[PDB]
Ligand binder design. Structure first.
Ligand SMILES: c1cc(-c2ncc[nH]2)ccn1
Ligand SMILES: c1cc(-c2ncc[nH]2)ccn1
Lengths: 236, 236
C-alpha cells in the first residue's frame, strides 16, 4: 500500500534526512513511500522572493506570507487529487501519540504544511487545513522536524517498509560488560521463560517510569500476575 | 554562550538538516552552536563494518553492536572534555516538554546517542548514559529525528540565536481572505486592547483544546478575569 506525502516547506532540502537514509530512505527508493515538496518561495512574484509578512496588531515577529503559501498549498492539493488530508504541524494541534499515528497512517495521501516564523494566518487554517497536530509540548524553530517525525512514524505502517508498555531491557555480546552480566534466563534457551521475563520487565519499567500509561490499559490475566510479581520483588 | 553538542549516529548526514538550514543553520555558521558527529561504523574493525548484533534470548530484531558504539561514545566524551552530559534518545526516557528543554539547555556540552534497530545494550545505558529522554509516545525508526528535535529546541536558548499557554491566532495581509475578516481590534492601533485580546484568545484556546495545561498554571488576576470572560462568551 503506497503512501504519498506532499510537503509544503521553505526548507525542502531538510527532508533529504528522511528520503535519503535508513528505513524511510529505503521506502522511498522502493516506491513504497513518495515524498513531494513544494516551496512557497517558488510561488512568489516579487524580485526578492518574499515569504514573510507583518502581523496585524503589531508586535515582534513575522508570519508566513499568505499568497505564496496559499498558492503552494493549492498546487500540492492539485497534485494529490482526491482524498488527501491536509495537516498543519502546529504547537496548537492535537498531541501526537501512537494512537494518533495509527489514525493518520490510514490515509493513503497526506499533505503536511510546515510553518516558520510566528506561524500562519488563522484564516488559512480555517480555509485550507483539515487537522492541526503537535509532536510535543516543546518549542521549535519550524514545522519541518515535526513533519519529518510524523512521516517516519506513519512510514512504519506501510507494508514492506519494516502494545502500550515500555520495552524490556535488551542485551547482546559480550556476556560480561564492565562486570555486568547478562540475565541467565536470556541464555537458557527457554523460549517461554524468556517471553515471560521480557513481559514482566516491560510491566515493571512502565510502572516505575511511566505509571500513568498503565492506568490506560486493560491488563490481561498474565500481565496482571507478572506486574504483581514485579511490584512484590521491588518491595523486596 | 556557545553550546557544543556531540552526536553519536549511524547516519550523521541526517544532521545536515539542522546544521545547514534556517535558524539552527545560522547558529552553526556563526559559531553559536557546534554540532560534531561520530559514526559507530567508523569504529568497526571487520571487513564489512558491522554495527548490529543479535540479542541474547533470541527474538526478532537486532541491537546496536556494543564495541563500535562504546568506542564512538568514548571518543565523543574525550572530545567534550569535562562536564558533558550524555543523553540517550529513547522511548523509555523522560518525556520531553518545554520545562525539560529549559533544563537541558543549562548545559554547555551535551552528547546525544542515537539508537537504531531494537536499541542498545542495557549495560551500556548503565555505564555510559547519564539521562534517557523521549520526545514523545510514538514509535520511530531511529533516535536521529529526536536528537535533531532536541538540538533545535535547546538551540533557541543560546544568546544571539533568535508561558504555558497556547498561542493566540495571528493575521496578516490581506484584510479579507475568502470572506474572512481580520478582528477589528487588531487594526485599532490600541496596544493595550491588542495585548489583552491576544492573551484572552490564548487562554480561550488553551481551555478549549488543552484544558489539562491550565490546571498546571497559577493564573494571574488578569488571566483569571480574561479566562472567565472567554468562558462566558463561549457559553454565549
Ligand atoms: C508541531 C509544530 C511545531 C512548530 N514549532 C514552530 C513551528 N512549528 C512544534 C511542535 N509540533
Ligand atoms: C526518542 C527516541 C525514539 C526512538 N525510536 C527508535 C529509536 N529511538 C523515539 C522517541 N523519542
Amino acid at each position: 500500500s503506497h503512501m504519498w506525502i506532499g510537503v509544503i516547506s521553505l526548507f525542502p532540502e531538510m527532508f533529504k534526512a528522511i528520503t535519503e537514509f535508513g528505513v524511510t530512505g529505503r521506502a522511498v527508493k522502493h516506491n513504497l513511500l513518495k515524498v513531494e515538496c513544494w516551496n512557497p518561495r517558488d510561488f512568489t512574484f516579487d524580485k526578492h522572493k518574499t515569504v514573510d509578512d507583518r502581523p496585524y496588531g503589531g508586535g515582534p515577529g513575522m508570519l508566513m506570507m499568505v499568497q505564496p503559501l496559499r498558492d503552494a498549498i493549492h498546487t500540492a492539493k492539485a497534485a494529490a487529487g482526491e482524498g488527501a488530508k491536509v495537516i498543519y504541524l502546529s504547537p496548537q494541534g492535537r498531541k501526537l501519540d501512537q494512537g494518533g499515528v495509527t489514525e493518520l497512517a490510514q490515509n493513503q495521501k497526506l499533505i503536511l504544511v510546515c510553518g516558520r516564523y510566528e506561524g500562519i494566518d488563522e484564516r488559512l487554517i480555517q480555509t485550507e487545513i483539515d487537522e492541526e497536530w503537535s509532536i510535543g509540548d516543546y518549542v521549535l524553530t519550524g514545522g519541518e522536524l515535526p513533519a519529518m517525525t510524523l512521516i517516519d512514524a506513519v512510514a512504519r505502517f506501510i507494508p514492506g517498509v519494516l502494545d502500550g508498555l515500555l520495552d524490556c531491557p535488551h542485551y547482546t555480546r559480550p556476556e560480561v560488560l564492565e562486570g555486568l552480566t547478562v540475565p541467565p534466563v536470556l541464555m537458557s534457551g527457554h523460549h517461554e521463560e524468556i517471553r515471560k521475563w521480557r513481559l514482566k520487565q516491560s510491566l515493571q519499567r512502565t510502572w516505575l517510569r511511566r505509571p500513568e500509561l498503565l492506568e490506560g490499559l486493560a491488563l490481561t490475566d498474565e500481565q496482571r500476575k507478572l506486574l504483581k510479581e514485579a511490584q512484590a520483588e521491588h518491595n523486596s
